[PDB]
Amino acid sequence: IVGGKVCPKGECPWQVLLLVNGAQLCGGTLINTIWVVSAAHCFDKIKNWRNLIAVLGEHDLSEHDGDEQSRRVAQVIIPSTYVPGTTNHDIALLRLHQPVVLTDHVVPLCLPERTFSERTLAFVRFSLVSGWGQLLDRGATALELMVLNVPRLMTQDCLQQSRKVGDSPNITEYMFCAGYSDGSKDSCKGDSGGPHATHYRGTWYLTGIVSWGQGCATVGHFGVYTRVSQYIEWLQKLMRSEPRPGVLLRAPFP
Amino acid sequence: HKDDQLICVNENGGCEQYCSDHTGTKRSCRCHEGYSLLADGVSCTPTVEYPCGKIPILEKR
Ligand SMILES: [Ca+2]
């Protein structure tokens, strides 16, 4: 996260840290005791899925305070429409091998119903994005969890406020822009898969997933996030299904 | 004052959480798992220790 602040320990309880062979891979969002939502591209170059670990209750990577809870990842479900190496349909649903225990430092973010998210949450100006990603473009990653408040924009406004690149991916109906174009605040590499949380009447909901963007905090550019509302039904159906052999699972979408 | 409103699209139908429209001048509010709907028909109250979307350290101030 660039231009943000440290998320006070426990104020980002749904934040998940994904590790591969002990190394930081991506962020994620706990939505219940055994399910985590992340970004599909996070698993583009995974060799052995048996080395994927999800950590809840994490805050400071330099120490262990006992609030951390680690779980193996039993399943990584990606939409059939996602194509490795691209940006569209950047979402993944992870099933933990064992549920985490809810505590003051480990709490799920609410996955909203489609209607509510499209006709209410989508209209909430600011939302929080968080992660242990790079603090600066081409810079080192954060040791403490960082958080940033970013304003959401209409896809039409985004395109009309962003500098054309041509080779740059297009903004589909499965994504949305959020952030600033003055190159001051934005999510960055390492934050991918993390939550874009929206508050409404005292409760927080998952509205987006850190997906991509031109560099980090690049002037004339906004961060791009996966529009979670388009996958509510897809996610709910999968969470009611039985686990299947093999970690990786491509599921039809819609 | 707190109730009223039918169209869920307008001000969330007055619901604190989820809203559903019914045939005619009807509206039903609902709450996420771990919450119950109050008698006002719009408010949601936690029914568990750790409901989703709530920050414990802040709820306890
Ligand atoms: Ca720690």
Per DSSP, A175 falls in state E
Contact status, residue A102 vs residue A171, Cβ threshold 8 Å? no
Separation of CA B57 from chain center: 22
Q: How far apart are the first and last CA of chain A?
A: 32
A 10 A CB-CB count for A37 gives 25
Q: What is the CATH number of the domain that holds A44?
A: 2.40.10.10
A205: in domain: yes
**Peptide bond preceding A254: is omega within 30 degrees of 0, i.e. cis?**
yes
Instruction: Please give the C-alpha separations between residue A71 and each of A36, A50, A137, in angstroms, as whole numbers.
Output: 11, 11, 30
Q: Which helix (H) or strand (E) holds A236?
A: helix A232-239
Contact status, residue A27 vs residue A132, Cβ threshold 8 Å? yes
Instruction: Please give the C-alpha separations between residue A138 and each of A47, A89, A135, A187, B25, in angstroms, as whole numbers.
Output: 26, 26, 9, 13, 57
Q: What are phi and psi of A224, to 5 degrees?
A: -110, 135
Chain B residues within 8 A of A13 when measuring between CB atoms: 55-56
* Catalytic positions of A: 41, 90, 192
Residue A106 tokens read as 């480990």
CB pair distance less than 8 Å for A119 and B17: no
A139 and A17 belong to one structural domain: no
Residues B15, B5: Cα–Cα separation, whole Å? 9
- From B15's Cα to the closest Cα of chain A, the distance in A is 10
A90: in domain: yes
SS3 A48: coil
A42 and A70 belong to one structural domain: yes
A 10 A CB-CB count for A58 gives 25
CB pair distance less than 8 Å for A201 and B52: no
Cα within 13 Å of Cα(A202), Cβ side = 12
Contact status, residue A195 vs residue A5, Cβ threshold 8 Å? no
Experimental method: X-ray
Burial A2-23 (b: 16+ CB within 10 A, else e): bbbebbebbbbbbbbbbbbeee
Per DSSP, A144 falls in state B
A193 and A218 belong to one structural domain: yes
Per DSSP, A186 falls in state B
- From A220's Cα to the closest Cα of chain B, the distance in A is 33
Residues A1, A19: Cα–Cα separation, whole Å? 18
Residues A16, B52: Cα–Cα separation, whole Å? 15
A203 and A152 belong to one structural domain: yes
A191 and A225 belong to one structural domain: yes
Q: How far is the CA of A236 from the centre of ligand 1 (A)?
A: 31
Residues A39, A211: Cα–Cα separation, whole Å? 7
Cα within 13 Å of Cα(B52), Cβ side = 23
CB pair distance less than 8 Å for B50 and A203: no
A2 and A127 belong to one structural domain: yes
Residue A77 tokens read as 């479900």
A251: in domain: no
Q: Which helix (H) or strand (E) holds A70?
A: strand A69-79
A250: in domain: no
Contact status, residue A38 vs residue A26, Cβ threshold 8 Å? yes
Contact status, residue A208 vs residue A228, Cβ threshold 8 Å? yes
Size of interface A-B (CB pairs under 8 A): 64
Q: Which domain holds residue A138?
A: 1-12+109-229
Q: How far apart are the first and last CA of chain B?
A: 29
Please enumerate in sequence order all residues whose Cβ is within 8 A of that of B18, keeping only pairs 6 or more positions apart, or say none.
A112, A113, A115, A116, B29, B30, B31, B32
Give me the DSSP letters along A147-211: EEEEEEE-HHHHHHHS---SSSPP--TTEEEES-SSSS-B--TT-TT-EEEEEETTEEEEEEEEE
Total number of domains in chain A: 2
What kind of fold does domain B1-61 have according to CATH? Laminin (2.10.25)
Residues A61, A145: Cα–Cα separation, whole Å? 8
Compute the C-alpha angle A100/A105/A106, nearest 5°: 30
A142 and A100 belong to one structural domain: no
Count of residues making up chain B:
61
A156 and A187 belong to one structural domain: yes
Residues B43, B32: Cα–Cα separation, whole Å? 11
What resolution (Å)? 1.7
Residues A128, A252: Cα–Cα separation, whole Å? 30
Q: What are phi and psi of A235, to 5 degrees?
A: -65, -45
User: In chain B, whose CA is at the least distance from the CA of A198?
Assistant: B53
Q: Which helix (H) or strand (E) holds A161?
A: helix A155-161
Contact status, residue A109 vs residue A195, Cβ threshold 8 Å? yes
A253: in domain: no
Compute the C-alpha angle B23/B28/B30, nearest 5°: 145
Beta partners for A149? Answer: A128
Contact status, residue A220 vs residue A84, Cβ threshold 8 Å? no
A98: in domain: yes
A186: in domain: yes
